[PDB]
Amino acid sequence: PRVTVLVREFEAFDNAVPELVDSFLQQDPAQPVVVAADTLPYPPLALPRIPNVRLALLQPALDRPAAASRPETYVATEFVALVPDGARAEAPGLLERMVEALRAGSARLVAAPVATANPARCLALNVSLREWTARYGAAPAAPRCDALDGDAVVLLRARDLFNLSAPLARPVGTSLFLQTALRGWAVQLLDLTFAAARQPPLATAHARWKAEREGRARRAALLRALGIRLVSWEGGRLEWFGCNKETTRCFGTVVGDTPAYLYEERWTPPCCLRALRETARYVVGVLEAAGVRYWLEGGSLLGAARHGDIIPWDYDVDLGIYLEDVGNCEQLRGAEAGSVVDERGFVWEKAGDFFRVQYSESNHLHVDLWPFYPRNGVMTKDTVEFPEHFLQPLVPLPFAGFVAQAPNNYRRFLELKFGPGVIENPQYPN
Amino acid sequence: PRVTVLVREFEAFDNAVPELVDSFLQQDPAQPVVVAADTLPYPPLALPRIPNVRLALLQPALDRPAAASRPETYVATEFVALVPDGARAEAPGLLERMVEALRAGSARLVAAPVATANPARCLALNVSLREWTARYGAAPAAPRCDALDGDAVVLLRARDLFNLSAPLARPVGTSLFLQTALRGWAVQLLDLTFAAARQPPLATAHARWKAEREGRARRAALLRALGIRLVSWEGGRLEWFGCNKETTRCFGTVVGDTPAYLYEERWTPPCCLRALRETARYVVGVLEAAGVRYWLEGGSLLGAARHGDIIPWDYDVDLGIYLEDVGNCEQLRGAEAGSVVDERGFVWEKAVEGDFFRVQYSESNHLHVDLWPFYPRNGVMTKDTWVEFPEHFLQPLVPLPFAGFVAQAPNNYRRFLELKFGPGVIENPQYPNPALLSLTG
Amino acid sequence: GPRVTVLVREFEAFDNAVPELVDSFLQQDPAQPVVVAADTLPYPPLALPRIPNVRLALLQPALDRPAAASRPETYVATEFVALVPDGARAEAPGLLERMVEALRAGSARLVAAPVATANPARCLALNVSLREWTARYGAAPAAPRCDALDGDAVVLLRARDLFNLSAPLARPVGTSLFLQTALRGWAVQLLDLTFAAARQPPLATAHARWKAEREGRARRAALLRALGIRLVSWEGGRLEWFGCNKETTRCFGTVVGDTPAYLYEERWTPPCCLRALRETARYVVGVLEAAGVRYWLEGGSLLGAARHGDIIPWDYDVDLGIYLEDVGNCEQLRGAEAGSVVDERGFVWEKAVEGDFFRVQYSESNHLHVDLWPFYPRNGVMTKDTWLDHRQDVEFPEHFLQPLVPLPFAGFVAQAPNNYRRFLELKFGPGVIENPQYPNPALLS
Amino acid sequence: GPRVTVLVREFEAFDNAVPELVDSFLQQDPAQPVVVAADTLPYPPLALPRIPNVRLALLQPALDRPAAASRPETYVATEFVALVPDGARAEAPGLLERMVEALRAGSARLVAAPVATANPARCLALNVSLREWTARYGAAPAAPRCDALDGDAVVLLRARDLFNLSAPLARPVGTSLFLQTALRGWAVQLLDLTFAAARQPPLATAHARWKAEREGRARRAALLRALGIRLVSWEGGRLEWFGCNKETTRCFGTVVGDTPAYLYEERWTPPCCLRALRETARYVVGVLEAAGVRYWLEGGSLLGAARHGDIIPWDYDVDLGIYLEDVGNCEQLRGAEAGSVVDERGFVWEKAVEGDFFRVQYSESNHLHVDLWPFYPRNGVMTKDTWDVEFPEHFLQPLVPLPFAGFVAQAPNNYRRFLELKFGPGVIENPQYPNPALLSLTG
Ligand SMILES: *[C@@H]1O[C@H](CO)[C@@H](O)[C@H](O)[C@H]1NC(C)=O
Ligand SMILES: *[C@@H]1O[C@H](CO)[C@@H](O)[C@H](O)[C@H]1NC(C)=O
Ligand SMILES: *[C@@H]1O[C@H](CO)[C@@H](O)[C@H](O)[C@H]1NC(C)=O
Ligand SMILES: *[C@@H]1O[C@H](CO)[C@@H](O)[C@H](O)[C@H]1NC(C)=O
Ligand SMILES: *[C@@H]1O[C@H](CO)[C@@H](O)[C@H](O)[C@H]1NC(C)=O
Ligand SMILES: *[C@@H]1O[C@H](CO)[C@@H](O)[C@H](O)[C@H]1NC(C)=O
Ligand SMILES: *[C@@H]1O[C@H](CO)[C@@H](O)[C@H](O)[C@H]1NC(C)=O
Ligand SMILES: [Mg+2]
Ligand SMILES: [Mg+2]
Ligand SMILES: [Mg+2]
Ligand SMILES: [Mg+2]
Ligand SMILES: [Mg+2]
Ligand SMILES: [Mg+2]
Ligand SMILES: [Zn+2]
Ligand SMILES: [Zn+2]
Ligand SMILES: [Zn+2]
Ligand SMILES: [Zn+2]
């Protein structure tokens, strides 16, 4: 029952890794221990320079072979225990007990909380790569859970850990369970408890603040690298890791009416959908303030009728307007002379049948406004047409968080425009 | 089929990779081809959907196994030919001709220029990790060289390529030869030319500007990641990638009197030495203008006597001054009352601790010159906090080259240094010792 | 499930196939843990792959290394370890795992697989007797279950068992390992799996082979001496000696307090020294008989003869009584009164300094000896003028010498007093024949 | 409960006072832990008290013992160990306790107390250089704080420090202990406490001392060779050598791949090998000057002369150039064209296998060598018809004196230029010592 201790989560400027390592060596002087890091920690860790204790440096180097940064190559045992900074081994044979639990149970990971101020708690977790989203909540079947929040020793087989795509990406507590929950693995939070370091790290408030800030930065870089734009929690809290008003949109220019996320087998990033909703809400309120007649058009009306929202692989919003009302709103008249950035940062342009409103100068998610005019009972443009009774009157229809205006009898309208059954038969990307 | 074509250097927004792939497949339908990218290239490359053409995405991903991001997974032949975008296969048999050249010569790498506007040139390259420097120059034994500049097809054994730490780090033209030259491997530039693509990529000024901006950013990040702080051409045309007046110094706060770079088995970053030279020259200029008697002290004097420069693993500069001259210098007078940022960004501080003065390069970069005031008492220079020495060593001072200018040193400075440090200190440098440092701490 | 560290110990630095060995295992598993152990850093360089799972363990002390750096168990983190000799190659995949599975399913603590060299391992029986400094090998009665192996094999066992031995990696490992496991009652199961031989085997030339065999023979002799094996025997009767001879010193050095050093080590007289004592006793008796000197077995030599016709197994010399008036008959004895004499066979004869007796030494260098005690009849009672402070040194009635009787001793027939039971009880006490004890029980019993 | 274990390692089986030593400590505290350590069972018998707190530790492999039996830490259950030499005696009660109090309150890893023998311990400075294979001793400038002790002292340190060393009990302990602790930068503090001497001191006769010293110097020589200490010096002098010489092979033997064995050891050239190289160079230069052969320092020899007046400390030969037209002046050189020549002082002169140069080896057995490269002017350029880059003749018109290896050699004029032509700009100022990591990568 040989288990390698692997230490990955610590701060070079303030850690208790020498105590952690010394505590395991007091129980077994030949205990295999691997401390992993991206660069050589400074100030020096000053680990014991004995063969069973090794520092694994994970970044590339001009003077090292490929194997030197592959952590599986430092681990020879069947099992591996991930130990966070702040833990120490006090009683003996605790790794042995965790191994027995793993072999007895049905969960590929077992875990023991560390008696810190934040000992690990069970969590439910779903990961939807298609929607770039990870959803956390309370774990119904605890102590069997999908993920942990807080400090714990996690033990699993080395062949399971190191066949993951990113086994030691930081923060481990986020990165590991995103990968294992996606594979359908469970973690059993055992009743065993590891003691805290007798001299804990981050004792001052300044040190904790510094560490929390570095940790938030690592978590944000991790989620961006792995395609998680949104972390949501049971109870409503949202964590965003995508585009915003001062960045570019996530996918950039489209070619052939197929954005890049479709070729990645994903749908629209949720931050982009959020920016579209708020631009739809903004434009609609501007149009209504100026007394401009508008209705939902094209795919936006289709999504409104289907689920009251933007079709989740769509990437813009379409509204129709009465051409004779264009003069009623200041931004449109401005848009005819040139680009107009208004007081809220939105960008209105004509560019030349329609108008386009972009979320911001940098973020080019947009709403298109298509002007129609009644020529003789049918609405028509000049660069397909439809009867004007569909606009007399217009009906309320929930869309993108607010109440939009839609053609009356819009299901009939939508089957006119797209064919029979379009609401019930979405054209899923493949 | 013994060679796998591997395409790493191209841009998603403007490339000729489809023509490249097609050109090799027209010569052999079964030719193994791997296009490597960090993420899925957009717009779609639309490569042929055949078993011998694979798109390798090297970034880690939540739904992929470890092997998916390891490039050797995608290659099953003895050799790899790195092919830059813009090249095209025209004459058949070029790859197998390059294999024959490799087997018969002594170079680990063989290369063929691509007939673009920037065809590959043979280069010398010396890589010193201790001094964080990559020194390029003209190749004395061309067409045997250490590195190439420009477009070439590069063939080598897959075993050799994928044993490197960063075999496909971009730019390949830079990271490959940094790694192979450090190992002492040669590349042989053959008398063979690959043709250029018939529709070349990046054919507009705007497209090339975009590509060059992105390539420069990738190179700067690569050199920092690998610890190359200085790149030179024939000892000149310096390109810096380290610290400067507006940043922190490279190694930050020193703990235990041993800076971080010694644990990394290296010497002082050359950007830090450059800043130390500039600060010493500036301080000496100020002290002489104000009429302040100074001399090189400690390891600065030792370095000056040894080779006229800072000892290349030291990280500061020490000068002695006459205490009664302190009042002559505005900055030193100001430093007694508090920290002073002068006209040119240098920070002058009075040590309340050890009773010396410290001049820092900038507010953010704490590379420093230390100033040690002494005062005579019965012919012996002494101070009140802590070795004292006879005053006659200062009567007179003598000129001594140091750090690119002429400094002042005690007369008989070899005797001076020997009394301070021991006999033979000038001839017997205390070279850094990683093994010992690993043992003592 | 099973993790096995490959550990290489048996190779020559001047000529070996370790690179091929290690590379063959890396071809089956790139992260395969491999430990090469050596006493000093091999030159020319081994040039192993400088990868974290391949390590060089140096078993030498060094000024800049902790104690752990030369203890090989700190390099092995796995449950199991496989000792692999140079000249072997990993060819079939998963052989180590099949070995782990056989060990777990069997009852032996060691399992082994031959290597397809010109000398593949073979099953042997082995008895070790430290008290008699002897190792006895024979044919395996219950093959493929053995006590020892002869020849090349991969040997797999638990790290905790290997590294709890006193000298786990002493060379030659093929000798050293099974001396330690057989003494503990452990068995090695010879499995029906075969590792392939190296494609470019080491020691390809006759000259390189010949230098390797002599270096190995020197290491084996050093190992056996270090561990106190003086004699190795094989079924068929063949003997290898590793102690005394006519041309060296005797094994133990000067004896204080009647108790030689080996008895405090809980061992008996080395077999090297006993053989020489028998050769010297046989020779001296022949000289005295040919010279017409009446002699009889004395002291511990007579007691050993009465018990089992041989030297007592913990004694270190031989004693004979002679008639003083016969001394002049023997050329060596006449010479010995004038000084030290080295005779026709290299035996050394001297008249001692202590107490009016003669001593015959096996050689000039080897001081195993026969002591000759001259007696003369006073009035029917044998006597001498100077006495040693032993309870065994007394007068005795001449009728015990009239006549002498034959009695086997040390491989030949010797002359003994008649009624030698009563003779022995008179000088040692009642029941001496039936109650063996060490030369002086107040110190060691 | 006691917190120090007395440990005895330095004694001779044939003549010791270890029974008196043990008894004296047990008299102060009958429970005092005592370990006597030896490589084999001491004979004649020590006959130590048969009590649980007195133990004999035999540090020898044995067929019937567990690995732990030969590991000294196995025998020590206390925080501290006191190494006590034979000839010492415990009289004043509570001396070990004062030593523990001294160690805890000071900043030295080791504390020591002299034993009042005829050779009481003295405080010494010691610098250990593994790269130069040298131990330099001297007077201790900051006594009572030392790097090392000479003479008889009880030494106390933590068990975890002592048994963490590679060779904690290697003999003689007085040498091996402080080589290990001084290398680590640990201090020993010589306390103002004295242990008494044994009432019946061991080794009381001249003959007994003679035997003890003979085996002790044998142990020291084997210890220093095993640990890679080739040279011991006192105050820079009184050299004591433990390497190669005129009668032996050179330390690193045959060089494969132009990389001598000492580089893989992460060390530089052994000092005995450098000493023989200086002697051979001085001799060869003396011969060539007497015979009228023009020569000059060449290659790395010139580089070492220009940099610090000596052989570069990780180089292992010496290179000189000569005028080919002058070779006939020297008898040894003339003989070398016919075959190998062992001259009157044992040096071996040979004309190269292939490569047209001459080689002078230190002796028939020791192959440290000086190479001579003959050049000849072909219109103002020096050239050898075999290939040491060709160079212009004016660098030798005239030659200049240059200190090298303890004597004055001839160098090309403007040797700074000369070296930069052959090695590249700034070569004198940019020495780069061996890089073992780079050696481990490239081979
Ligand atoms: C043992 O020595 C090594 C130095 O080689 C050091 O790293 C380690 O911490 C030491 N251990 C103890 C317990 O002193
Ligand atoms: C995860 O998926 C299940 C459906 O399989 C769902 O009911 C559950 O609520 C999801 N978990 C979270 C935390 O949203
Ligand atoms: C992945 O799993 C397989 C099968 O368990 C194993 O052979 C391989 O070593 C694993 N990869 C690792 C540990 O990197
Ligand atoms: C990989 O590179 C290392 C040098 O760091 C070398 O030791 C090893 O042999 C190389 N492996 C192969 C297969 O070339
Ligand atoms: C080993 O001892 C056993 C036990 O008496 C005996 O049966 C066997 O004959 C001996 N074998 C050898 C080879 O001496
Ligand atoms: C000796 O065996 C024990 C168990 O019996 C084990 O814990 C220990 O690691 C072993 N020691 C060595 C040095 O292998
Ligand atoms: C030891 O080294 C120091 C510093 O290098 C030096 O001052 C001292 O003289 C040296 N001592 C001896 C005995 O060599
Ligand atoms: Mg702390
Ligand atoms: Mg659109
Ligand atoms: Mg300083
Ligand atoms: Mg007898
Ligand atoms: Mg006797
Ligand atoms: Mg040479
Ligand atoms: Zn977005
Ligand atoms: Zn810098
Ligand atoms: Zn014997
Ligand atoms: Zn030498």
Side-chain angles (χ1 to χ4, degrees), chain C residues 298-301 315 317-319:
Chain C
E298 259 295 353
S301 305
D315 199 359
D317 65 29
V318 165
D319 293 289

Side-chain angles (χ1 to χ4, degrees), chain C residues 366-387 389-390 393-407:
Chain C
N366 192 319
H367 290 154
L368 294 161
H369 64 70
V370 172
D371 278 338
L372 303 177
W373 302 87
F375 287 85
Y376 67 92
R378 184 88 133 91
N379 298 320
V381 161
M382 302 307 282
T383 320
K384 52 192 174 72
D385 299 340
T386 60
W387 304 94
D389 196 87
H390 291 70
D393 214 31
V394 292
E395 300 177 328
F396 67 91
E398 173 163 37
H399 72 62
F400 277 113
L401 306 184
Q402 304 170 325
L404 305 161
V405 301
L407 195 61

Side-chain angles (χ1 to χ4, degrees), chain A residues 316 318 356 366 368 370:
Chain A
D316 71 354
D318 292 297
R356 158 152 318 159
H366 71 69
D368 282 342
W370 306 85

Side-chain angles (χ1 to χ4, degrees), chain B residues 229 242-243 249-250 269 271-272:
Chain B
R229 296 263 192 288
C243 67
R249 71 183 177 194
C250 290
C271 44
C272 301

Side-chain angles (χ1 to χ4, degrees), chain D residues 167-178:
Chain D
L169 301 181
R171 305 192 62 182
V173 179
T175 295
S176 88
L177 181 58
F178 302 119

Side-chain angles (χ1 to χ4, degrees), chain C residues 195 215 283 317 411:
Chain C
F195 286 74
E215 171 57 62
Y283 167 77
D317 65 29

Side-chain angles (χ1 to χ4, degrees), chain A residues 28 30, chain C residues 71 73-74 159 161-165, chain D residues 67-68 71:
Chain A
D28 181 358
Chain C
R71 296 175 175 187
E73 77 256 27
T74 71
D161 289 338
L162 171 61
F163 297 121
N164 262 277
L165 308 168
Chain D
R71 290 172 179 185

